[PDB]
């Protein structure tokens, strides 16, 4: 089935490097735009950015633009999300979201309710 | 406490749907072939029915 | 101007008044008398011995204003006969005294050759609104319609102007005149003359039910299209009926003199104008709101040139609002004036077809999708 | 103990999928592939059925095979007779918001559901000699997908609240719950015994429901998208599923795993209905295309396609005599095809 | 406009060579 | 008889056929609109005697790619906007990037103007480089430190209704109001019956 595990976070200091990998599987990675989405401590789910299927409409919230780096290796199945300069205000759940259809620039995948093409999360605590 | 809850329902259910008896692929598809060529006759869609018999004529 | 069918009549009582004028006597002669001669062309008395003579012309005669103090000049022989000076002919007479066309082979060229592919790209274009179920709209109804109103303009210019040709022109060369003169007074030259008045007013009037329909959707009100294509259609072929038909009860109760296209009385043709002009009129007000409302939906959305330089194009074929536009955005009678007024009218039957069928998208792309089943 | 919930449910999915692979020994293509194609199928258009206002969500076959039931968002009911194209029942609707409509396999009752989170029952035979609403269902917090009678007095429901329920119409209450979906139960179909049922929801999942204890017994993942239809095979043991991953996919209740995939490169779209032939031969399904395509079931080769819609095609029936298809669209028309 | 006037002008210079051939043919 | 019969079944679809014909010219009449921020709401109003329809989703869950595509035939979609911005962003993003949506119109009111006068520079660190469109109206008496704010907002949604021409939908920025919806709607009828015609 559809499977999103996401790898890497962890505790790190204010600033620094931390990289986020997203194992996919059960699809074709090539067909869909991904999303990166956070659910910071006392607040909903938050949306970080996308990449599309071929990786050149790549688009971040305001919050994180500058900083982040989101790259898709569709060979490989995986996406990455190099995070630099982590703010405190950074410490969250990192989902890692797919798209519902494919061949389409159109995503609903920030619910709470359980969005079925989401990952289990990473911690990232800064 | 709540993704807990949410846990042991989908556990339980794993657990109790990895328990029943699967056949042979092969023994499962021989059928889905054998239903389909013993009901051939009765499909007026794959043997189109002379047009004396179709209601939609 | 003069009528042929004035002229033939206006010979026969000249032969009728001559001829009994020869059957009475005369003053005698020497014993010798030119015999009365009545020819088709001339009727003279007797002709006294060695008398040379000039006749003046005929008062019959169309052109007595251009001529009228000249004479043919005539001799009469000594043995009371014509002179035969002539070889082939045993009458001789010398009658000089007494007696622009490639502009119209040209135009009728182009008149006529529109009509053609007018007629020819309109029956094209109405069999594929109706043979696609797909294109019937209350839009499609009106162009539908309007394609057999222009079907029917084209069609009475050929059965008219064929008429004419046949009944005048190939009559005068076999010398068919007398049964010629019987379609004059017929009721064919009634019917056929009334149902091109008929078909050029039923013209006029669906171009205005083309443009109220598009005013109408554009400032939309309460509309039952079941009850607004009752007095479209009532409109579109009613109303022409309702004004063409009073003008030909005045031109048969009235000068019914020559066929029906004599124009005497100028206030006898304002039955079948006025109207005409009302539905060219207001058709001019409707382009210029619509084209008012094109600017403005292109005034938000900020070339306005070319945007709206397509749909001022396409859209007086559909509303035929040339005819003010030639009248005052361009000696008055020349071959370029002719050339525009004519060409664009005969096309326009034409250009409705190509413009809103056979490019429009909703009916190419049926096209597309019946291929791709085939 | 979340991580460990989660390390044991990791298990027994491994568990599961060892299983299916160890009983994967032959593919259902490898068995029918010395088999006599069906050939190129040619279906026309016999009806178009022209009184709806808006697009069409759903339709129903008649167990005569002769009536049918559409449901269109303008807020109608329209029955149909099949064979004179003549209109029997309008019924109009308090929200025109309808996504579904059933009909009972006895023509007494029709149902529909939709945004409104209710599912109405119409009385078609009364002495008062007019519809009126037999009951109204409510409990479901999500839209209705789907309806399907198992008698005059049972009827059961999807809804877009990620569960199935059993209604008890006399009473109006839900008999038996049906949990355990992630999305949006969109359709289901009932087994020709009525004993159980499967339903396919909006996250890449079929599960197969017992109707009397109300409990699940598998669960089938094969899709990469949203299931938005669902169909049994027609001996029972098998069903098949359209997704908006552009495939349709055959699951086996005995096996317990996929055996055929049906899609092609040249879809791109999702498949919005899917129903099989009367023998089990055919798989018809509709797609986002405008088009249906007709599917050799034990090949998976494109039979053939109907292509006469305009707009999306989103239901799509074929009789109990299999005598006849009819398809609705977006486009507002019902076409029947054989 | 219509070119009713073509209509008439049509009927106009032909009526004139209708009546050219009906007094040519008269004189002889 | 068949024949006695099928003359009563021809009556019916007689009489439904004239109340079919009613039907049509009220559902034609009416102009129905989603209102996006029992399982859904509707509202009833007029406008210049235009009956207007509008609903309002009620218990639905928040995955809307199902039960969206319900309301493609709409009239228009009034969005309403109180990171919440970014994702009503993200939300505009979906509806007019949809395949079902890209002939819908969104109406699209820039609400809690209010509010936003009273108080997003660390949701938008782009939000240091922006001035007030000159282009644009302000509102008398009002310091140009919210208008700023009230231009970047409807900016940010018009990047992302004029990137996509794909379909024949247009977006009406607003801010906060029935007339508004009203001669939105009158704007919408009338592209769409400019381009039947090829005059837009």
Redesign the interface.
């Known amino acids: 089935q559809v499977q999103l595990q996401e790898s890497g976070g962890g505790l790190v200091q204010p600033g620094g490097s931390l990289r986020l990998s997203c194992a996919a599987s059960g699809f074709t990675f090539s067909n869909y735009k991904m999303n990166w989405v956070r659910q910071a401590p006392g607040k909903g789910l938050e949306w970080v950015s996308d990449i599309s299927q071929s990786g050149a409409s790549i688009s971040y919230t305001g919050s994180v633009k500058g900083r982040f780096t989101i790259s898709r290796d569709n060979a490989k199945n995986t996406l990455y999300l190099q995070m630099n300069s982590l703010k405190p205000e950074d410490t969250a759940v990192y989902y890692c979201a797919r798209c519902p259809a494919p061949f389409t620039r159109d995503c609903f995948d920030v619910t709470s309710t359980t969005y079925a093409y989401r990952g289990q999360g990473t911690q990232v605590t800064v | 406490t709540a993704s807990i809850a949410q846990a042991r329902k989908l556990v339980e259910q794993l657990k109790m749907e990895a328990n029943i008896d699967r056949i042979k692929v092969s023994k499962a598809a021989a059928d889905l072939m054998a239903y389909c060529e013993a009901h051939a006759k009765e499909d007026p869609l794959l043997t189109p029915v002379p047009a004396s018999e179709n209601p939609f004529r | 101007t003069v009528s042929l069918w004035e002229t033939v009549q206006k010979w026969r009582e000249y032969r009728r008044q001559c001829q009994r004028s020869l059957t009475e006597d005369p003053p005698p002669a020497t014993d010798l008398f030119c015999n009365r001669t009545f020819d088709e062309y001339a009727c003279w008395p007797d002709g006294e011995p060695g008398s040379f003579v000039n006749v003046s012309c005929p008062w019959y005669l169309p052109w007595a204003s251009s001529v009228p103090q000249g004479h043919v000049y005539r001799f009469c022989t000594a043995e009371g006969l014509w002179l035969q000076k002539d070889n082939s002919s045993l009458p001789w007479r010398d009658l000089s005294e007494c007696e622009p066309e490639e502009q119209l082979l040209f135009l009728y060229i182009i008149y006529t050759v529109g009509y053609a592919l007018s007629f020819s790209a309109l029956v094209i274009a109405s069999a594929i609104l109706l043979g696609f179920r797909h294109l019937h709209c209350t839009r499609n109804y009106i162009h539908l319609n309007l394609f057999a109103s222009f079907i029917l303009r084209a069609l009475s210019v050929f059965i008219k102007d064929a008429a004419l040709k046949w009944m005048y022109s190939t009559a005068a060369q076999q010398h068919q005149w007398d049964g010629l003169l019987s379609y004059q007074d017929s009721l064919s030259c009634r019917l056929v003359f009334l149902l091109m008045q008929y078909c050029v007013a039923a013209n006029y009037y669906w171009l205005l039910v083309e443009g109220v329909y598009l005013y109408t959707l554009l400032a939309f009100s309460v509309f039952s299209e079941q009850w607004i294509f009752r007095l479209y259609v009532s409109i579109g072929w009613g109303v022409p009926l309702l004004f063409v038909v009073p003008w030909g009860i005045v031109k048969y109760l009235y000068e019914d003199e020559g066929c029906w296209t004599r124009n005497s009385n100028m206030n006898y043709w304002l039955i079948i104008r006025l109207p005409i002009l009302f539905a060219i009129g207001v058709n001019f007000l409707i382009f210029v709101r619509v084209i008012c409302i094109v600017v403005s939906k292109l005034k938000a959305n900020l070339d306005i040139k070319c945007r709206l330089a397509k749909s001022t194009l396409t859209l007086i074929p559909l509303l035929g609002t040339h005819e003010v536009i030639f009248a005052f955005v361009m000696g008055t009678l020349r071959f370029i004036k002719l050339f525009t007024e004519l060409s664009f009218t005969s096309f326009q039957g034409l250009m409705v077809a190509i413009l809103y069928c056979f490019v429009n998208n909703e009916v190419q792309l049926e096209f597309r999708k019946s291929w791709e089943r085939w | ?2 991580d460990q ?2 390390q ?2 990791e298990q ?2 491994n ?2 999928r060892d ?2 692979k ?7 293509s490898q ?2 592939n010395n ?1 006599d194609p ?1 050939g190129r ?1 040619q ?1 026309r258009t ?2 178009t059925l022209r ?1 709806h ?3 069409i ?1 759903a339709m129903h076959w008649g167990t005569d095979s ?1 009536l049918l039931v559409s449901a269109s ?4 009911l ?1 029955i149909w ?4 194209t ?5 019924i ?1 609707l308090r ?1 025109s ?1 309808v ?1 579904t409509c059933a009909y009972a396999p006895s023509g007494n009752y029709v149902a529909c559901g ?5 599912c109405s029952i119409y009385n078609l035979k009364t002495r008062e000699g007019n519809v009126r609403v037999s009951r109204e269902l409510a409990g479901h ?3 209705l ?1 789907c309806c399907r009678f198992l008698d005059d007095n049972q009827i059961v429901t999807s809804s ?3 569960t199935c329920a059993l209604w008890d119409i006399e009473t109006g209450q839900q008999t038996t719950t049906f949990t ?1 979906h ?3 139960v ?1 359709s289901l179909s009932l087994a020709p015994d009525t004993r159980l049922f499967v339903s396919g929801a ?4 079929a599960k197969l429901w017992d109707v009397r204890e109300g409990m ?4 089938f ?2 899709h ?3 299931i938005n239809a669902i169909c049994f ?3 029972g ?2 069903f098949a599923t359209g997704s ?3 495939t349709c996919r055959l699951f ?1 209740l ?4 996929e ?1 055929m995939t049906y899609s092609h490169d040249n879809i ?1 779209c ?1 498949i919005t209905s899917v129903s099989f ?6 798989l018809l399904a509709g797609y ?1 295309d405008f088009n249906c395509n007709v599917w050799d ?2 090949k998976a080769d494109r039979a053939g396609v109907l ?2 819609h ?1 707009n ?1 095609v989103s239901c799509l029936g ?1 009789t109990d ?5 009819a398809t609705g669209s977006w486009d507002s028309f019902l076409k ?1 095809w ?1 | 406009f219509g070119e009713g006037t073509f209509t008439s002008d049509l009927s106009k210079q032909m009526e004139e060579e209708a009546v050219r051939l009906f007094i040519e043919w008269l004189k002889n | 008889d068949q024949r006695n019969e099928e003359k009563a079944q021809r009556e019916a679809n007689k009489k439904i056929e004239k109340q079919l014909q009613k039907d049509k010219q009220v559902y034609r009449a009416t102009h129905r609109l989603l209102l996006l921020g029992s399982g859904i709401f509707e509202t009833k109003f007029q406008v210049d005697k235009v009956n207007f329809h509008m609903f309002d989703v009620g218990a639905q869950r928040d995955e809307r790619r199902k039960w969206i595509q319900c309301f493609n035939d709409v009239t228009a979609i009034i969005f309403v906007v109180a990171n919440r911005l970014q994702a009503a962003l993200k939300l505009f993003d979906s509806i007019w990037n949809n395949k079902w949506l890209r002939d819908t119109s969104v109406i699209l009111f820039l609400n809690k103007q209010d509010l936003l006068a009273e108080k997003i520079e660390d949701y938008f660190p782009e939000f240091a480089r922006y001035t007030t469109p000159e282009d644009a109206t302000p509102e008398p008496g009002e310091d140009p430190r919210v208008t700023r704010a009230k231009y970047f907002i409807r900016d940010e949604f018009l990047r992302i209704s004029t990137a996509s021409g794909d379909g024949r939908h247009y977006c009406y920025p607003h801010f906060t109001n029935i007339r508004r919806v009203f001669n939105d709607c009158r704007d919408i009828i009338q592209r769409m019956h400019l381009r039947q015609y090829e005059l837009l």
């Not at chain 4, 968002?73 to 109608?76: F, I, N, P, S």
């Not at chain 4, 005995?254 to 795993?257: E, G, L, T, V």
């Open positions: 103990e979340l919930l989660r044991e449910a027994l999915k568990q599961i299983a299916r160890a009983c994967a020994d032959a593919t259902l068995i029918t088999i069906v199928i279906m016999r009806r009184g206002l808006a697009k969500y002769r968002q303008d807020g109608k329209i007779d099949s064979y004179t003549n209109k029997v029942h309008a109009p929200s918001w996504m939709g945004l409104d989170n209710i917090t999500g839209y997908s877009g609240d990620t355990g992630t999305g949006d969109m909006c996250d890449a999942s699940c017994r598998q669960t993942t094969g990469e998208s949203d095979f027609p001996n043991n098998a908006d991953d552009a086996d005995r096996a317990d795993q055996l791109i999702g032939s009367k023998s089990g031969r055919l986002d079931a034990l292509a006469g305009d999306r074929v005599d299999g005598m006849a298809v029947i054989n």
